[PDB]
JSON list of C-alpha atoms and ligand atoms in Angstrom, two decimals:
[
{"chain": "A", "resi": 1, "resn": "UNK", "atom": "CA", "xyz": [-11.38, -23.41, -3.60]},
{"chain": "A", "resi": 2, "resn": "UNK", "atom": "CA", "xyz": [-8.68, -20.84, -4.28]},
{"chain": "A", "resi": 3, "resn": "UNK", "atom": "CA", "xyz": [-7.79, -20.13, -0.18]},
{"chain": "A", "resi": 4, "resn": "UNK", "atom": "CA", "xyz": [-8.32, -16.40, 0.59]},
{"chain": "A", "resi": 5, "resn": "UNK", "atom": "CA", "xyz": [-7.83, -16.85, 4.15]},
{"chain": "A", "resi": 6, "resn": "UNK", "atom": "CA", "xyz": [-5.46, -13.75, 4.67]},
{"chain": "A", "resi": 7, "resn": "UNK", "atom": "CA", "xyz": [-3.13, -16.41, 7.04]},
{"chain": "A", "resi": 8, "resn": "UNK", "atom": "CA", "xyz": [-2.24, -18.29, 3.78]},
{"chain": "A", "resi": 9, "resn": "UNK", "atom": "CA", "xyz": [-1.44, -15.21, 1.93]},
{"chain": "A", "resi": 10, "resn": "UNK", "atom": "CA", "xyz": [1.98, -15.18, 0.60]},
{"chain": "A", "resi": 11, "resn": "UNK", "atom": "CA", "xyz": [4.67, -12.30, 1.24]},
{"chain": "A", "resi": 12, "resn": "UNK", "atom": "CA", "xyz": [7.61, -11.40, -0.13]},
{"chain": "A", "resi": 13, "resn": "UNK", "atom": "CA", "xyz": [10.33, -13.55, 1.42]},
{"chain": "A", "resi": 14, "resn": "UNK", "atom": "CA", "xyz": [13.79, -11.90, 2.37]},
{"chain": "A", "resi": 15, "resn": "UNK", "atom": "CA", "xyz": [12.04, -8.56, 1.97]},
{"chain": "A", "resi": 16, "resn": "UNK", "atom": "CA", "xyz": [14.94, -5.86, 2.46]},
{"chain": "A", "resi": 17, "resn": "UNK", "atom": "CA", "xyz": [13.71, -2.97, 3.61]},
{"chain": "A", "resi": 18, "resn": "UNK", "atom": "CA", "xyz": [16.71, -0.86, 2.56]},
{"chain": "A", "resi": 19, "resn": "UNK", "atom": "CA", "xyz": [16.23, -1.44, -0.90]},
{"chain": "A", "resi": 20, "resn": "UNK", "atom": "CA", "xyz": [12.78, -0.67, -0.78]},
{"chain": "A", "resi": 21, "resn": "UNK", "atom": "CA", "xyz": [13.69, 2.43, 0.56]},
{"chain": "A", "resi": 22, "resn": "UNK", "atom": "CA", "xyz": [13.19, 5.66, -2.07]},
{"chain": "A", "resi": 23, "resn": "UNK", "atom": "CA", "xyz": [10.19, 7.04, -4.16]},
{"chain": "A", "resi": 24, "resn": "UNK", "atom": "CA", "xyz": [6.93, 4.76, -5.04]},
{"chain": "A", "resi": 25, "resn": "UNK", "atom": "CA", "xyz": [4.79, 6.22, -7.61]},
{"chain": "A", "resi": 26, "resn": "UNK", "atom": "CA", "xyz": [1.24, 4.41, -6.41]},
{"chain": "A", "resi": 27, "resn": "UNK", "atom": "CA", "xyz": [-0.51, 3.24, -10.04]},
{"chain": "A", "resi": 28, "resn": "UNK", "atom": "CA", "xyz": [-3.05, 1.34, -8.87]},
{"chain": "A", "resi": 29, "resn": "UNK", "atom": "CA", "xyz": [-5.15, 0.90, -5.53]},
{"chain": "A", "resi": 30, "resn": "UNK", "atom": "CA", "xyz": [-7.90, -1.15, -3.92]},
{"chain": "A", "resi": 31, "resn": "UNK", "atom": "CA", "xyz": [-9.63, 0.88, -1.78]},
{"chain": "A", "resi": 32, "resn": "UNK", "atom": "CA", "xyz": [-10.77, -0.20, 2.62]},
{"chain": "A", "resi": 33, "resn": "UNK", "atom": "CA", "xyz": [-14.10, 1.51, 3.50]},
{"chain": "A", "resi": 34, "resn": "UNK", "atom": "CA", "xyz": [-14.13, 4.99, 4.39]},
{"chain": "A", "resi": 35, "resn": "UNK", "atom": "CA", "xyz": [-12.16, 8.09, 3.70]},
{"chain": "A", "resi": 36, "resn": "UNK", "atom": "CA", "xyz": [-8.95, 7.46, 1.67]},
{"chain": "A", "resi": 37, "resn": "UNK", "atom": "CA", "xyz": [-6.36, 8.75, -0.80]},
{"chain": "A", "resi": 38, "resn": "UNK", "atom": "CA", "xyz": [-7.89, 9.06, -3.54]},
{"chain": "A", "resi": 39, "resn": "UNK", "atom": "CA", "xyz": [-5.32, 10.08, -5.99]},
{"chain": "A", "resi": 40, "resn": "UNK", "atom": "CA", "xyz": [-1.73, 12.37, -6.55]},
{"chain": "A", "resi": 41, "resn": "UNK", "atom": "CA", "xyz": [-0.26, 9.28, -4.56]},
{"chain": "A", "resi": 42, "resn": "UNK", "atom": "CA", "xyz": [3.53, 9.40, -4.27]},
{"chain": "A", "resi": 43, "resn": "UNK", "atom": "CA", "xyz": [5.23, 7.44, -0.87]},
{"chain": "A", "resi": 44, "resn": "UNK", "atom": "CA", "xyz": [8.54, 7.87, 0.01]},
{"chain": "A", "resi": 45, "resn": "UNK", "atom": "CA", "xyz": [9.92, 4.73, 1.80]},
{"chain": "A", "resi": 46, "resn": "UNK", "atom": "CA", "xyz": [13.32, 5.31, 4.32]},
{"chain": "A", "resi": 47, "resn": "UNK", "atom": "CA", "xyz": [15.61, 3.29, 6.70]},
{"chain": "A", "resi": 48, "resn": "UNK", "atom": "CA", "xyz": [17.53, 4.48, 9.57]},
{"chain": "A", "resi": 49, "resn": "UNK", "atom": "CA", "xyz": [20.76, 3.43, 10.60]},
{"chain": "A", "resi": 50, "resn": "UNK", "atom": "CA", "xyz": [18.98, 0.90, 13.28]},
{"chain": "A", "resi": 51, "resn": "UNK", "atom": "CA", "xyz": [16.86, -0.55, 10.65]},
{"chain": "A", "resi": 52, "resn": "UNK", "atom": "CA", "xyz": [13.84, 1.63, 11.27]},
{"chain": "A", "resi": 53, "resn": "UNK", "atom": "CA", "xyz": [11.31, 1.67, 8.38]},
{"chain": "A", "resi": 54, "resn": "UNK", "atom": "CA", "xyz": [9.20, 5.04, 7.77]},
{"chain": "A", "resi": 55, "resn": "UNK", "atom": "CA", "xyz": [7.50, 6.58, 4.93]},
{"chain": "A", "resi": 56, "resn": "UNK", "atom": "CA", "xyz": [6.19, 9.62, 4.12]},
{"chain": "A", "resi": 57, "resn": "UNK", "atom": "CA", "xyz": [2.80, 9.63, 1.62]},
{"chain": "A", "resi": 58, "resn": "UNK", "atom": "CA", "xyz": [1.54, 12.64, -0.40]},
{"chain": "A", "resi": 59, "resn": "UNK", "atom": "CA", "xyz": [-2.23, 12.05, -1.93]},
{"chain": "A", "resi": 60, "resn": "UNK", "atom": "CA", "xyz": [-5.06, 14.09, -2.46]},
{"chain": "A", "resi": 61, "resn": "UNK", "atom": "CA", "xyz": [-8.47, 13.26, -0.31]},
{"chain": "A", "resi": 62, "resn": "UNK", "atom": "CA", "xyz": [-11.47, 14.89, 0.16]},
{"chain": "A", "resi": 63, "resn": "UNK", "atom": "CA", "xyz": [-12.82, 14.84, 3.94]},
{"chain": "A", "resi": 64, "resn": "UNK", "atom": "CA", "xyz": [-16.26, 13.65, 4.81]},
{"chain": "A", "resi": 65, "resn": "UNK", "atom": "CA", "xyz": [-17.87, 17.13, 4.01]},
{"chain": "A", "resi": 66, "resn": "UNK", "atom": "CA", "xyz": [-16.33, 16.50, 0.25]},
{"chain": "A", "resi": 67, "resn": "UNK", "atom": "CA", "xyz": [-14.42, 19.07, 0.67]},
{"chain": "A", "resi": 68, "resn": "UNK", "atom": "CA", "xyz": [-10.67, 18.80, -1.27]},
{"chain": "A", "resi": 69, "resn": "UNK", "atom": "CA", "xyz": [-7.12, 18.49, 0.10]},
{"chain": "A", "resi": 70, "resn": "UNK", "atom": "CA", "xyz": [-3.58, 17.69, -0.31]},
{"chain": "A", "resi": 71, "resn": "UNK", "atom": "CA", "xyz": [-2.78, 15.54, 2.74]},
{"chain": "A", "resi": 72, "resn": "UNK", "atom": "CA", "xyz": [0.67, 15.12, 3.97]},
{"chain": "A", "resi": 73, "resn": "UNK", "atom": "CA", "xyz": [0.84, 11.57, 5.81]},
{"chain": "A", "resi": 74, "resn": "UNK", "atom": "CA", "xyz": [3.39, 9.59, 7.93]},
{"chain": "A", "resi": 75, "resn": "UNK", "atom": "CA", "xyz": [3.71, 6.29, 8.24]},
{"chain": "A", "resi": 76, "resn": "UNK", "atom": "CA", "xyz": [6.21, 4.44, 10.82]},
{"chain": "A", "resi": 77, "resn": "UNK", "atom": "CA", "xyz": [7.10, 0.62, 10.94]},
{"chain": "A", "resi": 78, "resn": "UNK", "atom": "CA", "xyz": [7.23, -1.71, 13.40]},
{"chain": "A", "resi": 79, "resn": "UNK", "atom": "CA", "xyz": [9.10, -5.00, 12.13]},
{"chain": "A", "resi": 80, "resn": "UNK", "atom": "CA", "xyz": [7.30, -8.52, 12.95]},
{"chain": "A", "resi": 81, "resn": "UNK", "atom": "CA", "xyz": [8.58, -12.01, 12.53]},
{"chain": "A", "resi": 82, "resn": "UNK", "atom": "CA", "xyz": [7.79, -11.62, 9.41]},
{"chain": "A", "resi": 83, "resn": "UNK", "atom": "CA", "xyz": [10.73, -9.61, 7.59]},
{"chain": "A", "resi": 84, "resn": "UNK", "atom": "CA", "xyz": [7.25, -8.59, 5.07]},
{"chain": "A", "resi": 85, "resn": "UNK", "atom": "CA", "xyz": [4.75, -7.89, 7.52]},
{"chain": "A", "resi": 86, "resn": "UNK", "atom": "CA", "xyz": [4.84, -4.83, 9.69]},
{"chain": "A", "resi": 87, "resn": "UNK", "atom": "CA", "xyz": [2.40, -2.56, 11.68]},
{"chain": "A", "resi": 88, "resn": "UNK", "atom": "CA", "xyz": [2.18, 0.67, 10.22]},
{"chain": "A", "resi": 89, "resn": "UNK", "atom": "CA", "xyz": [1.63, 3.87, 12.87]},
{"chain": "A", "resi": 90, "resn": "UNK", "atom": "CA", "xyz": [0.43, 6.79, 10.70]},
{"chain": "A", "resi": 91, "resn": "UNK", "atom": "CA", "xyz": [-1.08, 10.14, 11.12]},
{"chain": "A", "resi": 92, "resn": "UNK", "atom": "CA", "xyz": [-1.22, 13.35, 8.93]},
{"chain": "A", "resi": 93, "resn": "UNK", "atom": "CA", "xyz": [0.96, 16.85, 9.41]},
{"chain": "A", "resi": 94, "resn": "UNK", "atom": "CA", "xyz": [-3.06, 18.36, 9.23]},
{"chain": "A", "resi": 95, "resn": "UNK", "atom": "CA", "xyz": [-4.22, 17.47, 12.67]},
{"chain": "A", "resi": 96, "resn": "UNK", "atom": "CA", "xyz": [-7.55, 16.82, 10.88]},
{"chain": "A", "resi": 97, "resn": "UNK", "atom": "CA", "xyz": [-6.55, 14.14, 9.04]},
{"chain": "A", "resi": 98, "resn": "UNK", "atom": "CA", "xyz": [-6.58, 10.02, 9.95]},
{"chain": "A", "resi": 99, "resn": "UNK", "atom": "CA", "xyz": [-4.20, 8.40, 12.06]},
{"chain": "A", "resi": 100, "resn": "UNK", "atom": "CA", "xyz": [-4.68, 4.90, 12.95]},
{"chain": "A", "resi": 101, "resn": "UNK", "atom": "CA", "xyz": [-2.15, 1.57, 13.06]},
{"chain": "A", "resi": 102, "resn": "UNK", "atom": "CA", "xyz": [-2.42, -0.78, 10.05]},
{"chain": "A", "resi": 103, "resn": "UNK", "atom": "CA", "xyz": [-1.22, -4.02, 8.68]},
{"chain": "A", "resi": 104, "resn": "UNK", "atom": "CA", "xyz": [1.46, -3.34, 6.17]},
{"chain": "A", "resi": 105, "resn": "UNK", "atom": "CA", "xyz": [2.51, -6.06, 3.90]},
{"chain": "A", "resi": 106, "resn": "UNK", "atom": "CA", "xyz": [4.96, -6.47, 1.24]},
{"chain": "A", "resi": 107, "resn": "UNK", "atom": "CA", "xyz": [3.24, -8.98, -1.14]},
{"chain": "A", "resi": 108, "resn": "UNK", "atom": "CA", "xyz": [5.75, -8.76, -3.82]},
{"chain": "A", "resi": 109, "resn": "UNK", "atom": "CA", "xyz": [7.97, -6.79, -5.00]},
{"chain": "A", "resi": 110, "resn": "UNK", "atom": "CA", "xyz": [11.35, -6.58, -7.65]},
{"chain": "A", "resi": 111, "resn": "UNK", "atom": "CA", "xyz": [12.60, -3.32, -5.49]},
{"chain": "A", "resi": 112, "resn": "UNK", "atom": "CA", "xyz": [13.17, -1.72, -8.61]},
{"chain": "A", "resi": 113, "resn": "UNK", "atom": "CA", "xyz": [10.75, -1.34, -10.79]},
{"chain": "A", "resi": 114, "resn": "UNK", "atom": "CA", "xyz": [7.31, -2.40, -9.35]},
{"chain": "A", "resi": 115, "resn": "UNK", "atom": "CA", "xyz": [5.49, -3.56, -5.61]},
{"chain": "A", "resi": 116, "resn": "UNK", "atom": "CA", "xyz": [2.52, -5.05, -4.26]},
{"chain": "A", "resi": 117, "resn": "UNK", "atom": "CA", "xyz": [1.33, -3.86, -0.87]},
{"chain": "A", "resi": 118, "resn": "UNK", "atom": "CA", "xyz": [-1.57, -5.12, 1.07]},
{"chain": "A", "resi": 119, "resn": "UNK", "atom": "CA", "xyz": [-3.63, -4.50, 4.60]},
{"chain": "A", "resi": 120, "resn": "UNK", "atom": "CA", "xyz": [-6.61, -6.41, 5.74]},
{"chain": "A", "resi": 121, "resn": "UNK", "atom": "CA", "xyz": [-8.08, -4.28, 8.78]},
{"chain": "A", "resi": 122, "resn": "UNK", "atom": "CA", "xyz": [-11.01, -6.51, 9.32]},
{"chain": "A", "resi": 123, "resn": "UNK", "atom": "CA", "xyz": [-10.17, -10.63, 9.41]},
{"chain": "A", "resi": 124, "resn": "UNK", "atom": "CA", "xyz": [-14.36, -12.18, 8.43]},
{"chain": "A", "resi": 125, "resn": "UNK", "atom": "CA", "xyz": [-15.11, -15.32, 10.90]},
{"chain": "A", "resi": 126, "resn": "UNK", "atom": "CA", "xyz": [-13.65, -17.72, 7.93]},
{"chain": "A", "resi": 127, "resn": "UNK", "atom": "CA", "xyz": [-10.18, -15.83, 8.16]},
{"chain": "A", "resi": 128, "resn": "UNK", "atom": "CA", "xyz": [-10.78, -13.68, 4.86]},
{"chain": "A", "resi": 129, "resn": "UNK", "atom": "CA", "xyz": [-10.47, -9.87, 5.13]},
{"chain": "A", "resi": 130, "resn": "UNK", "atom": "CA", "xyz": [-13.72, -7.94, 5.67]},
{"chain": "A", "resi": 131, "resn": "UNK", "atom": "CA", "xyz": [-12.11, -4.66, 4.69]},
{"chain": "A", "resi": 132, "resn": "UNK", "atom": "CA", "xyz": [-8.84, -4.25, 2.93]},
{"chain": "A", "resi": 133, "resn": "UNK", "atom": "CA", "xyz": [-6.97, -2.03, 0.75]},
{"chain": "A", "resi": 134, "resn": "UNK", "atom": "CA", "xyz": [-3.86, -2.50, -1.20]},
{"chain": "A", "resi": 135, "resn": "UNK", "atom": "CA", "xyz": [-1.19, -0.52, -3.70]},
{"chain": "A", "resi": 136, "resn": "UNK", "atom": "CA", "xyz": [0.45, -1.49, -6.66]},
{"chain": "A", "resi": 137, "resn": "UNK", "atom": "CA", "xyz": [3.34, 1.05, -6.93]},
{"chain": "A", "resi": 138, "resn": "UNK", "atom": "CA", "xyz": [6.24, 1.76, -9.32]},
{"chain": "A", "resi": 139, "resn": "UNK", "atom": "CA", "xyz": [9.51, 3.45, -9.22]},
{"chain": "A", "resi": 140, "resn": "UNK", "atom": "CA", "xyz": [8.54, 4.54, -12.90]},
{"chain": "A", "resi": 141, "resn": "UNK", "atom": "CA", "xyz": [5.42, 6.78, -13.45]},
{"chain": "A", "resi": 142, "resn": "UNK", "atom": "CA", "xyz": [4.51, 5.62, -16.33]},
{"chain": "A", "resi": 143, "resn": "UNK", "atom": "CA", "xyz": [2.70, 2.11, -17.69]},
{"chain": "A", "resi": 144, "resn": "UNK", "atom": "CA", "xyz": [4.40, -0.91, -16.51]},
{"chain": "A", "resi": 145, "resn": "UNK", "atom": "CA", "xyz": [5.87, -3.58, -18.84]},
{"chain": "A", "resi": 146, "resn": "UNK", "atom": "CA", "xyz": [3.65, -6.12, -19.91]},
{"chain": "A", "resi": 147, "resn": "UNK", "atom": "CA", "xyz": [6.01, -8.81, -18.43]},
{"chain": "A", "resi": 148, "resn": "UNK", "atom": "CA", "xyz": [5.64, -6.76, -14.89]},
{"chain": "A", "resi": 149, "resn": "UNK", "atom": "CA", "xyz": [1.90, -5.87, -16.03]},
{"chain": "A", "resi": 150, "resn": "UNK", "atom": "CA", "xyz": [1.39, -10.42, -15.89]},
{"chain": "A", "resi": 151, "resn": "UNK", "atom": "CA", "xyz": [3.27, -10.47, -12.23]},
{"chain": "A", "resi": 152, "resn": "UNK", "atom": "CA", "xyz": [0.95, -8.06, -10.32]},
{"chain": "A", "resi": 153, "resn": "UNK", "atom": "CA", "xyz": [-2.34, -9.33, -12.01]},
{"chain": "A", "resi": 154, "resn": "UNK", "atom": "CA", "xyz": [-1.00, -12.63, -10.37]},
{"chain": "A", "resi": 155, "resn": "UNK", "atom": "CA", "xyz": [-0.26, -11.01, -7.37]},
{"chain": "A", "resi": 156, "resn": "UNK", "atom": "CA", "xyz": [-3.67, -9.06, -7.02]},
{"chain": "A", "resi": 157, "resn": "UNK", "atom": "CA", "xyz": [-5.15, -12.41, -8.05]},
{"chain": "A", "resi": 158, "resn": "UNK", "atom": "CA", "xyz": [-3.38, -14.71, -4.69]},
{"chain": "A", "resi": 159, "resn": "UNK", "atom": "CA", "xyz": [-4.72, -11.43, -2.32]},
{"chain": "A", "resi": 160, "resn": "UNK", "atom": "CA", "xyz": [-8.68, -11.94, -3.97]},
{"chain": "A", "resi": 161, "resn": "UNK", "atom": "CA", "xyz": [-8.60, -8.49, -5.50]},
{"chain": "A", "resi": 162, "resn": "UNK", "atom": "CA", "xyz": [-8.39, -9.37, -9.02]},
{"chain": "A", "resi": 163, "resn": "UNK", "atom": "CA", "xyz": [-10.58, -7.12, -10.70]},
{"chain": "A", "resi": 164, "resn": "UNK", "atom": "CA", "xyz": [-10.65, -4.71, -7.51]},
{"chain": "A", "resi": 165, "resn": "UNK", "atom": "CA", "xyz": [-8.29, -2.45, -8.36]},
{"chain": "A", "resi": 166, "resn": "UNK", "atom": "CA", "xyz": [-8.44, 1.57, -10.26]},
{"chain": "A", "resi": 167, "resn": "UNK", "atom": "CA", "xyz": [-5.88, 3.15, -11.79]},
{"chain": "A", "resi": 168, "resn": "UNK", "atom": "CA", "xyz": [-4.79, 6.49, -10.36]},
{"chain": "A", "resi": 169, "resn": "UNK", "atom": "CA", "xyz": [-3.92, 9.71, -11.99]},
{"chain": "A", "resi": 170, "resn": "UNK", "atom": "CA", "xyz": [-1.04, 11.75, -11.11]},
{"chain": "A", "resi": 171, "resn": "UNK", "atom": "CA", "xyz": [-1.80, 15.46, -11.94]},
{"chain": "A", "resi": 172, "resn": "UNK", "atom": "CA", "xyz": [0.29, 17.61, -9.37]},
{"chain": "A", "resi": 173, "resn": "UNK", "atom": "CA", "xyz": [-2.69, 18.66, -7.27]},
{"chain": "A", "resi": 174, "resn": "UNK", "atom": "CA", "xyz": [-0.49, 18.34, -4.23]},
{"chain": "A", "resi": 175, "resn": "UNK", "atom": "CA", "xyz": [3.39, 19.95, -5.13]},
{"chain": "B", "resi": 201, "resn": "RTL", "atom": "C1", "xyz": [1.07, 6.45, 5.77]},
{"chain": "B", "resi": 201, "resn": "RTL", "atom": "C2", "xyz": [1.39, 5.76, 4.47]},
{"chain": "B", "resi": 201, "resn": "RTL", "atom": "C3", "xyz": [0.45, 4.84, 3.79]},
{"chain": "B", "resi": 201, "resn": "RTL", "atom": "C4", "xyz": [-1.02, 4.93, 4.07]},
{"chain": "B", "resi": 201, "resn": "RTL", "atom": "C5", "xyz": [-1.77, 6.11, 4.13]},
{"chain": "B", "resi": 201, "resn": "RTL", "atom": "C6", "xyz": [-3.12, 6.14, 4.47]},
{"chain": "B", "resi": 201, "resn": "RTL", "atom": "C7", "xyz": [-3.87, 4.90, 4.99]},
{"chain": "B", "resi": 201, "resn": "RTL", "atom": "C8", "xyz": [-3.74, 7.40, 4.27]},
{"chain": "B", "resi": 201, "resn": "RTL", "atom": "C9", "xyz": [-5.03, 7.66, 4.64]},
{"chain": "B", "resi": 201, "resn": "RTL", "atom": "C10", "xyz": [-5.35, 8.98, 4.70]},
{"chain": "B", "resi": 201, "resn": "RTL", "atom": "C11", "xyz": [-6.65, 9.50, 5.02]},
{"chain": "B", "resi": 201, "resn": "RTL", "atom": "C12", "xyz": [-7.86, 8.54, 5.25]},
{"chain": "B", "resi": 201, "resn": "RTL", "atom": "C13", "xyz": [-6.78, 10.94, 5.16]},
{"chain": "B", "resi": 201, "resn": "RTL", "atom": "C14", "xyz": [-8.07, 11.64, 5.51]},
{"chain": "B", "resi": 201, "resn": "RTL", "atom": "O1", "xyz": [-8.26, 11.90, 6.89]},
{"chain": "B", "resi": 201, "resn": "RTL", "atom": "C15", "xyz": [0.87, 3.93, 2.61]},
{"chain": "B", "resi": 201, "resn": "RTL", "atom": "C16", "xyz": [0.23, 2.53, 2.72]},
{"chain": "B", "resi": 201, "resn": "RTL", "atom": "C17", "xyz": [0.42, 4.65, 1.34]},
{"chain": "B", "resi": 201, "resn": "RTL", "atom": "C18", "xyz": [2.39, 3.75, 2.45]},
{"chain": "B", "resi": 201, "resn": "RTL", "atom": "C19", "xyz": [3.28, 4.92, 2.85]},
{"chain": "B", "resi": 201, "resn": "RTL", "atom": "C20", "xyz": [2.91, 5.60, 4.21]}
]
């Protein structure tokens, strides 16, 4: 079988978080169950001084009475063994919006032009994820490359996603 025990899963080794730091455009998503961005997704990744990851994350998302809005989210880091793999503390500035703590991992990524995120919130009883989302983002607005286009298909393909992913449209909703 193709192992998509999320233990097995490949990260990005070495992952620097200071060069990750900066503007992600998100192109592509998988969504968890439940409320989520939905689109107008934009994350901006920094690094303190002491090595402390945070990002902010702009995205439009309508709440469970439909109803339409710009949310304003933050995200902080907490580093693991894993220089990929953190826990990710978020909330919104709009009291109304979701907070929670989530698995935040740095599948791949060239720090420069594209990356692969993933979170499993759920592990099934066979080690797969029972609910997981995951970006594909890109310092670039625009298309990728076909030669990056091959890496994340390969990349969404190792997380069993292939085929699980939508495109999203940046319209400036939220600015
Ligand atoms: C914080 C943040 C992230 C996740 C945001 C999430 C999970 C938003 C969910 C918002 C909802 C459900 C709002 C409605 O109440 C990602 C991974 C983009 C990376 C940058 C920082």
């Amino acid at each position: 079988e193709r192992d998509c025990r999320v233990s097995s899963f490949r990260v990005k080794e070495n992952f620097d978080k200071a060069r990750f730091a900066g503007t992600w455009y998100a192109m592509a998503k998988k969504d968890p169950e439940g409320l989520f961005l939905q689109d107008n997704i934009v994350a901006e990744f920094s690094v303190d001084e002491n090595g402390h990851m945070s990002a902010t994350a702009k995205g439009r998302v309508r709440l469970l009475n439909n109803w339409d809005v710009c949310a304003d989210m933050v995200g902080t880091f907490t580093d693991t063994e894993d220089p990929a793999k953190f826990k990710m503390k978020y909330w919104g500035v709009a009291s109304f919006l979701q907070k929670g703590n989530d698995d935040h991992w740095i599948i791949d990524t060239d720090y420069e032009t594209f990356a692969v995120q993933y979170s499993c919130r759920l592990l099934n009883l066979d080690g797969t994820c029972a609910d997981s989302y995951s970006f594909v983002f890109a310092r670039d607005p625009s298309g990728f490359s076909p030669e990056v286009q091959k890496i994340v298909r390969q990349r969404q393909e190792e997380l069993c996603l292939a085929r699980q992913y939508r495109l999203i449209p940046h319209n400036g909703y939220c600015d």
